[PDB]
């Protein structure tokens, strides 16, 4: 490869970061998943250099992505802060189905800025399960308000159909590229 | 006080009245005892003379004899038979001085055991007088006992014989007696103002105190029972007041016990009196006074000893080299004290010895922990000071439990069956848990790196403390230090950082302090590689030292350490690449840069070995047996094995690029040597053109094997072999039409195969082949090297195809062939040709046979035989016999055939294929494979050689016959 990036898909429990990394690594999706015990470790050999040289498809630079599916249970939150030490980019995933995941986003960022690798953490906030419209209790306006207050980019991806997860992760990888071209 | 004077005076009044010659255990000399008593009392001789003057003026006590007379036996029978009851007449001559004991009938002797005093004045001038008179129920006389009193002392029980008064009866019998001598009511104020027993106790206390202070300057190893003259001066004022040994024994015990509570003497000297209360307590009785004093002294010695074994870390520490012995002696006088009837008199203490000993041990352990905590600097507020205080405290408790496990455990268990270590460890894990738990509570969830290191040292010390549990019979149910690892959970992300910040420290300095030179000439790496081994072993040692018993978190830390080791691998790779760049900016030598790249890739290979050892170092096999329960399938291989494999692949990059750089250089050399080898003239032998390429490959790869590990050298060999096979394949086509350089390339492939095989700098490519190798060697062996060899190969392939041909449409000629090994003549009988085709386009067959031996250059001097011509015959009859003069040496060679121009085997002919000479000639029928316009690739390589004419004649006639046979070829129906 040419770069090695350590994403951490980190969030609460029931949010489903495992399904997001499953639908980014391949197309397979599971109806029901058990809670993640310990942390997982996904791998992806993309060639993007931030994202494809034609805009979304082509040969850029070989990016080996580690995609750590950290636990959302509180029993594996304290020790998991050791993995934040060199964690370029963080995938804050919440669910539009429940609002507690929405209010915990600010607490999650507050925990992340004290454990960031570089001078400022990289965040893309993804409001997953955006296709299931029957239980959506989170409005777009509040989400974009929290995005603009904290300066973080936002997406409305979903894992049940696989839409927009790839674009969200691609532009987050792009953000990490802007930060490396900012750091030097 | 003043009693020290007055008691002193009493001593004189009891010691200058000492009368009688010396005993085996008592001495009679005033001057020595007086000077010893003055030395012990610290009294100057003028006061001694004043006291002697003051004791002369006191009136002398009237002396008397404690006449204890017992029964008499052994008297001869001259009286009436039976009823022998004599009476004794006690008297002393120099009521008033005589007495007659009443007689008892039906006895051999009266037994009454009473004693009456007999007042006398002088000892050396008076004789003992005692006579028997046996009244008869005549009053016959018996013997008497007469002895001088100078040999009469105290404690003189003996059997004395009665002296015969008349010679008519020789024996008078032997009577048991007990001789004492006591004083009357004496005149000293010292023994009469106070009771005699308490002044005896005080006087004996004075002698024991001055004995223990005069035997040594201090008192710790006084071994005797008493001084001899002190024992004598004790023995008087012990029997001269009508006193038995009973009050003397209790007085000895009281004085010794109160002295022990006053100043220390070794308590084995307490063992001699205590058993006396064991020996003499039941037969005697005490009044209401001094019995309570005996009980009070029992209780006071018990309390003093229990305050001693409560504080056994101070009064018996393991530094005076007899602490267990002195402690065991103290318990050995604590037992054999509760082991008599005399401990039934203790009202202050009824509860028994092991329970109260454990109570004192418990209180002493608690107080010792408290004083140790106050010792370990608690007066300064602050968290790191309390942390180092707790570290020192737990180290001291480890030391105390260690010395309680070896030494003090057995001496408490063998005597009174008390397990010191179990209770001590229970208490000192509770009192330490309640300190470390509160310390870690006020730590909070934020942990400083120095604070994390402090908690790490506390963690390993407490883990040692819990390790001591399993050597004490499984303390369970009182668990207060189990799960102590919970409180250190906030400190885990610091340690796994700090350990990493330790490890990343070492690998930062290791490349910094190393110039990457080969570590000697026996191994191939640098000090960075052995530093890797030590650093990764330190990481695994930290992981083992932690040993987290919780499963999922232990898996989580193991993944953390695996990513730390892989990240350190990538980091170290970047540092050695940067260090090689930094050195290459320093020097500009090609050889220095080459060997620098070499030592870098051996370091990478060593790191590959370390990473391969990581599943054994971090013990994933013992991990997956406990974290495979609640996890998912494939997760263990993904989180742990997959990043390790990616680290190995990232080592493969710049292992297979550092090797690839040298491989590119050497492949450029090999390719340019091959291209300059084909550029040499073709008029030179194929043995001197191989020399430069061969010596270059040999010397470069054979210097480079000593500079590289065998595994990386094996990879370099495989890459070089693949590249030189590719080069030789692409160079096998750029050759001239004569193709006589094909033998040069065959020699090249043979030597390149044999130079990759020579041991020491070549590794055998005999098990690992690739299709390019066999394809190239076969294609170029068929390319090499002369026209005749190609004709022979064509004839071999054509007869192999003819043997594979079974179709009868092309023509079947029936012949007989016999080779003779004794007549040299080949005999051929041609009979008939069957199932033929017309040799003319009109439809007329023309079977006429030229029986040639082919190839023509293989048979240069022979006249071929021919048969009669035939016209329009589908089954012509030849049936002719012909002889051929040819030796077996050209016939047995490959490619030799008998061709019938209208083949058949000539090396496999009957008579030469391993069989006998044919007496009867066999059949041999082969179908004719006509020349084809679609020729084999051999013909265009004959046609490259135009200098020779025979091969050109062969290929032109072959093309002519192929085009002529195509006109007579019958196309099959679809
Ligand atoms: N309909 C729908 N369901 C989704 C979507 N994303 C996730 N889910 C479902 O939500 C659950 C998510 O599971 P999971 O990834 O384990 O959630 P998590 O427990 O918060 N993450 P972790 O396993 O790391 O603890 C699964 O039932 C998944 O099917 C989505 O976009 N649409």
From Swiss-Prot, chain A:
UniProt catalytic activity: GTP + H2O = GDP + phosphate + H(+)
Entry keyword annotation includes GTP-binding: yes
Result for mutant: residue 65 to P: Abolishes interaction with SYTL2
Effect on the protein of changing residue 147 to P: In GS2; interferes with melanosome transport
Subcellular location(s) of the protein: Membrane; Melanosome; Late endosome; Lysosome
Annotated positions binding GTP: 11-19, 69-73, 128-131, 158-160
Result when mutating residue 18 to N: GDP-locked. Abolishes interaction with UNC13D and localization to lysosomes. Increases interaction with DENND10. Disrupts late endocytic pathway homeostasis
Motif residue range(s): Effector region: 33-41
Membrane topology: Lipid-anchor
Molecular-function GO terms, alphabetical: G protein activity; GDP binding; GTP binding; GTPase activity; myosin V binding; protein domain specific binding
Major site of localization recorded for this protein: membrane
Disulfide bond annotation, renumbered to this chain: 118-183
BP GO annotations: antigen processing and presentation; blood coagulation; complement-dependent cytotoxicity; cytotoxic T cell degranulation; exocytosis; exosomal secretion; melanocyte differentiation; melanosome localization
Mutation effect (residue 71 to V): Abolishes interaction with SYTL2
GO cellular component term of the entry, any: melanosome
EC nos: 3.6.5.2
Top enzyme class: hydrolase
Keywords linked to the UniProt accession: Acetylation, Disease variant, Disulfide bond, Endosome, Exocytosis, GTP-binding, Hydrolase, Lipoprotein, Lysosome, Membrane, Methylation, Nucleotide-binding, Phosphoprotein, Prenylation
Effect of residue 125 to P: In GS2; strongly affects GTP binding; cannot interact with MLPH
Disease involvement: Griscelli syndrome 2: Rare autosomal recessive disorder that results in pigmentary dilution of the skin and hair, the presence of large clumps of pigment in hair shafts, and an accumulation of melanosomes in melanocytes. GS2 patients also develop an uncontrolled T-lymphocyte and macrophage activation syndrome, known as hemophagocytic syndrome, leading to death in the absence of bone marrow transplantation. Neurological impairment is present in some patients, likely as a result of hemophagocytic syndrome.
Assembly behavior: Binds SYTL1, SLAC2B, MYRIP, SYTL3, SYTL4 and SYTL5. Interacts with RPH3A and RPH3A. Binds MLPH and SYTL2. Interacts with UNC13D. Does not interact with the BLOC-3 complex (heterodimer of HPS1 and HPS4). Interacts (GDP-bound form preferentially) with DENND10.
Family: Belongs to the small GTPase superfamily. Rab family.
Function: Small GTPase which cycles between active GTP-bound and inactive GDP-bound states. In its active state, binds to a variety of effector proteins to regulate homeostasis of late endocytic pathway, including endosomal positioning, maturation and secretion. Plays a role in cytotoxic granule exocytosis in lymphocytes. Required for both granule maturation and granule docking and priming at the immunologic synapse.
Protein name: Ras-related protein Rab-27A
Organism this protein belongs to: Homo sapiens
Entire-sequence positions represented here: 6 to 189 of 221
Swiss-Prot record, chain B:
One Pfam family it belongs to: MUN
Membrane topology: Peripheral membrane protein
InterPro entries: C2_dom, C2_domain_sf, MUN_dom, Munc13_1, Munc13_dom-2, UNC-13_domain
Binding site residues for Ca(2+) 1: 79, 85, 134, 136
Molecular function, one GO term: small GTPase binding
Signal peptide: none
GO process annotations (BP): defense response to virus; germinal center formation; granuloma formation; natural killer cell degranulation; phagocytosis; positive regulation of exocytosis; positive regulation of regulated secretory pathway; positive regulation of substrate adhesion-dependent cell spreading
Domain MHD2: 687-794
Residues annotated to bind Ca(2+) 3: 839-840
Tissue specificity comment: Expressed at high levels in spleen, thymus and leukocytes. Also expressed in lung and placenta, and at very low levels in brain, heart, skeletal muscle and kidney. Expressed in cytotoxic T-lymphocytes (CTL) and mast cells.
Highest taxon listed in the record's lineage: Eukaryota
Domain C2 as annotated: residue spans: 44-138, 809-919
Listed GO CC annotations: azurophil granule lumen; cytosol; exocytic vesicle; extracellular region; intracellular membrane-bounded organelle; late endosome; lysosome; membrane
Disease implicated: Hemophagocytic lymphohistiocytosis, familial, 3: A rare disorder characterized by immune dysregulation with hypercytokinemia, defective function of natural killer cell, and massive infiltration of several organs by activated lymphocytes and macrophages. The clinical features of the disease include fever, hepatosplenomegaly, cytopenia, and less frequently neurological abnormalities ranging from irritability and hypotonia to seizures, cranial nerve deficits and ataxia.
Domain notes: The MHD1 and MHD2 domains mediate localization on recycling endosomes and lysosome.
Function field: Plays a role in cytotoxic granule exocytosis in lymphocytes. Required for both granule maturation and granule docking and priming at the immunologic synapse. Regulates assembly of recycling and late endosomal structures, leading to the formation of an endosomal exocytic compartment that fuses with perforin-containing granules at the immunologic synapse and licences them for exocytosis. Regulates Ca(2+)-dependent secretory lysosome exocytosis in mast cells.
Name recorded for this polypeptide: Protein unc-13 homolog D
Organism name: Homo sapiens (Human)
